[PDB]
Amino acid sequence: HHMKQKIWYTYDDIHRVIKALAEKIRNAGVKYDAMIAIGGGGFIPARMLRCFLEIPIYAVTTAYYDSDNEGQVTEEVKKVQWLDPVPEVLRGKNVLVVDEVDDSRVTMEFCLKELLKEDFDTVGVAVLHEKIKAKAGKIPEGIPYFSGITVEDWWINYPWDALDIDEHNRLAEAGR
Amino acid sequence: HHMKQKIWYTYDDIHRVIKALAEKIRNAGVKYDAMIAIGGGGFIPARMLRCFLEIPIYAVTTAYYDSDNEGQVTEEVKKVQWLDPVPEVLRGKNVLVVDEVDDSRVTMEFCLKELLKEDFDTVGVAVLHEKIKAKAGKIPEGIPYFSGITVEDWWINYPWDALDIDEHNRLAEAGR
Ligand SMILES: Nc1nc2c(ncn2[C@@H]2O[C@H](COP(=O)(O)OP(=O)(O)O)[C@@H](OP(=O)(O)OP(=O)(O)O)[C@H]2O)c(=O)[nH]1
Ligand SMILES: Nc1nc2c(ncn2[C@@H]2O[C@H](COP(=O)(O)OP(=O)(O)O)[C@@H](OP(=O)(O)OP(=O)(O)O)[C@H]2O)c(=O)[nH]1
Ligand SMILES: [Mg+2]
Ligand SMILES: [Mg+2]
Ligand SMILES: [Mg+2]
Ligand SMILES: [Mg+2]
């Protein structure tokens, strides 16, 4: 249950945004050598982006876990799978971190801080949807940032969460 | 350029097959604890499958490389990213390997042989499309196998390779 407005996007809607996102990246003048998709949400955006950028997709995954510190239980982000070690072919290369939604930036900050420990040239970040809202996380300095589209602070319903894709598509069209 | 018949599938076409594939898996009676997606082709099928199976997606990636052995250059499959080491939470668990197409089975055999070196309970494999054709690779004994649909030996055009998704969808409908 959510209390804000809601929006549904078709697979094709998202594919079209990814094509435009690839063009934004290409126009910034840094040629990326590989993507690092943050699963699970970044996997589909990253493989769609590969259609247009034609660079390999490496993968990490994060998740929130119940953390009990100082007499208070809150959710914190942790690694589920990581690039340990980073392969030698990526040393000194440009890598593009890919995720589906910029909501709180807590995962994004965690992953970017960890990847800046490595021997990359340029680390950039590309997200499908950028929500306009307050952010708990911060993007480190010097990291190029791209979003496919900016969105209101609405709950986004992704087609890859649709038990009934026909009903999902109906709600997507009923929102246009 | 290909010399066989060709088919185009929409994103929604594939989503519907994945829903049916999840039902085939559920009916076989083994509860899988995690997926291992083989990138890049397995990423989108695996995240679609997560909608219905609700288990985490781990990732490996393979690619073909030019291999020069005994005075003859052929393409061979190699690791690009692997699960090194397998996390302890997966020890003794059931893992479902996910890929998009069963064509030659050379990648599938390579990955399954490598994953059988680990301490899993059940290793199963799920593929979106199973092509009916001769196979160079072999599936090890005792590995449950599921395919979403079986297909003729045709070239499959995936929507995540469509530079123009509208033209892609036109060709998909023109094939029904
Ligand atoms: N459907 C949907 N999900 C939203 C929306 N806003 C945030 N989320 C989910 O919230 C989770 C936490 O995201 P954040 O930590 O805020 O991500 P950020 O750094 O990229 O801004 C993400 O899942 P996660 O914990 O990273 O899991 P996974 O699904 O990526 O594996 C993301 O998918 C929204 O509008 N719609
Ligand atoms: N579009 C399309 N591709 C096909 C088709 N048949 C085979 N392929 C591609 O051939 C490559 C080699 O596949 P195999 O090694 O035969 O796969 P298998 O073991 O699962 O049968 C795969 O890409 P890869 O080298 O594994 O790369 P990636 O794209 O998965 O990263 C796969 O996507 C088809 O009908 N259509
Ligand atoms: Mg995520
Ligand atoms: Mg490390
Ligand atoms: Mg593959
Ligand atoms: Mg190993």
Residue by residue, what is the 3-state secondary structure of B54-114?
CCCEEEEEEEEEEEEECCEEEEEEEEEECCCCCCHHHCCCCEEEEEEEECCCHHHHHHHHH
Q: How many residues does chain A have?
A: 176
> What is the separation of C-alpha B149 from the centre of its chain, rounded to a whole number of angstroms?
12
A102 and A131 in contact (C-beta within 8 Å)? yes
> Cα angle vertex A165, ends A162, A166, to 5°?
140
How many CB atoms neighbour CB B163 within 10 A? 9
By C-alpha distance, which of A100, A118, A81 is closest to A15?
A100
The CATH number assigned to the domain holding A9 equals: 3.40.50.2020
Pairing of strands A34-39, A57-69: parallel
Which DSSP letter does residue B161 get?
A: G
Q: Kindly list the residues from chain B whose CB atom is less than 8 angstroms away from the CB atom of residue A45.
A: none
A94 and A36 in contact (C-beta within 8 Å)? no
Q: Which two tokens stand for residue B9?
A: 């599938």
As for how many domains chain A has, the answer is 1
Bond from prior residue into A87 cis (ω within 30 degrees of 0): no
Instruction: Give chain A's end-to-end CA distance (angstroms, integer).
Output: 22
Catalytic residue check, B103? yes
DSSP code per residue over A11-27: HHHHHHHHHHHHHHHHH
- A and B: number of Cβ contacts within 8 A: 105
- State in Å: Cα A86 to ligand 4 middle: 7
CB neighbour burial string for B58-90, b if at least 16 within 10 angstroms, e if fewer:
bbbbbeeeeeeeeeeeeeebeebbebeebeeeb
What span, in angstroms and rounded, lies between the C-alpha atoms of A96 and A143?
10
What span, in angstroms and rounded, lies between the C-alpha atoms of B57 and A60?
10
For the stretch A60-69, contacts whose Cβ atoms lie closer than 8 Å and that sit 24 or more positions apart, written own/partner, are A60/A36, A60/A111, A61/B56, A61/B57, A61/B58, A61/B59, A62/A38, A62/A107, A62/A110, A62/A111, A63/B56
Q: Which two tokens stand for residue A134?
A: 């307050």
Pairing of strands B72-81, B57-69: antiparallel
What span, in angstroms and rounded, lies between the C-alpha atoms of B64 and B58?
21
Pairing of strands B34-39, A6-8: unpaired
Chain B: give the shortest CA distance to residue A170, in Å.
Answer: 13
- State in Å: Cα B75 to ligand 6 middle: 22
Residues of chain B by 3-state class (helix, strand, coil), percent to 5: 30, 35, 35
- State in Å: Cα B65 to ligand 3 middle: 31
- Ligand 2: which residues within 6 Å by Cβ? B 39-41, 63-64, 99, 101-108, 137, 155-156, 158
DSSP code per residue over A87-148: PGGGTT--EEEEEEEESSSHHHHHHHHHHTTS--S-EEEEEEEEE-S--SS-PPTT--EEEE
Backbone angles phi, psi at B32, to 5 degrees: -80, 145
Any CB–CB contact under 8 A between A104 and chain B?
A: no
A61 and A87 in contact (C-beta within 8 Å)? no
Q: Which residue range(s) make up the domain with B44?
A: 1-176
Cβ burial of A160 (10 Å; 0-12, 13-18, 19+) is buried
Specify the 3-state DSSP secondary structure of A163.
coil
Q: Compute CA distances B10 → A21, A37, B14, B173, whole Å.
A: 21, 23, 6, 9
**What kind and span of H or E run contains A151?**
strand A145-151
| C-beta atoms of B63 and A84 within 8 A | no
Bond from prior residue into B39 cis (ω within 30 degrees of 0): no
Q: Give the largest Cα separation in chain B, rounded.
A: 49
What span, in angstroms and rounded, lies between the C-alpha atoms of B58 and B94?
13
Residues 79-98 of B with CB under 8 A from A: 80-81, 83-84, 87
Closest ligand to C-alpha of residue A104 is: 1
Pocket probe mutation, ligand 1, options A5, A100, A107, A146, max atoms within 8 Å of Cβ: A107
**What kind and span of H or E run contains B168?**
helix B165-173
Q: Which residues touch A63 (CB under 8 Å, ≥6 apart)?
A: A77, A78, A80, B56
Backbone angles phi, psi at B39, to 5 degrees: -75, 160
Closest ligand to C-alpha of residue A102 is: 1
> Cα angle vertex B131, ends B125, B133, to 5°?
115
Neighbouring-strand partners of residue B124: B96
Bond from prior residue into A159 cis (ω within 30 degrees of 0): no
Q: Which residues touch B176 (CB under 8 Å, ≥6 apart)?
A: none
Q: Which two tokens stand for residue A166?
A: 């026909």
Nearest atom in ligand 1 to the alpha carbon of residue A161 is 1
Supply the Cα-derived Rg of chain B in whole angstroms: 17
Q: Which residues touch B156 (CB under 8 Å, ≥6 apart)?
A: B6, B7, B9, B101, B129, B131
What span, in angstroms and rounded, lies between the C-alpha atoms of A39 and B39?
12
B143 and A31 in contact (C-beta within 8 Å)? no
Catalytic residues of A: 103
B8 and B168 in contact (C-beta within 8 Å)? yes
By C-alpha distance, which of B149, B135, B134 is closest to B18?
B149
Residue in the block written with tokens 């898996």: B25
Q: Kindly list the residues from chain A whose CB atom is less than 8 angstroms away from the CB atom of residue B80.
A: 56, 58, 87
> Cα angle vertex B118, ends B112, B121, to 5°?
85
Residue in the block written with tokens 């036109």: B170
Bond from prior residue into B137 cis (ω within 30 degrees of 0): no
Which DSSP letter does residue A70 get?
A: T
What span, in angstroms and rounded, lies between the C-alpha atoms of A28 and B70?
45
What span, in angstroms and rounded, lies between the C-alpha atoms of B176 and A38?
36
**What kind and span of H or E run contains A76?**
strand A72-81
Neighbouring-strand partners of residue A97: A36, A125
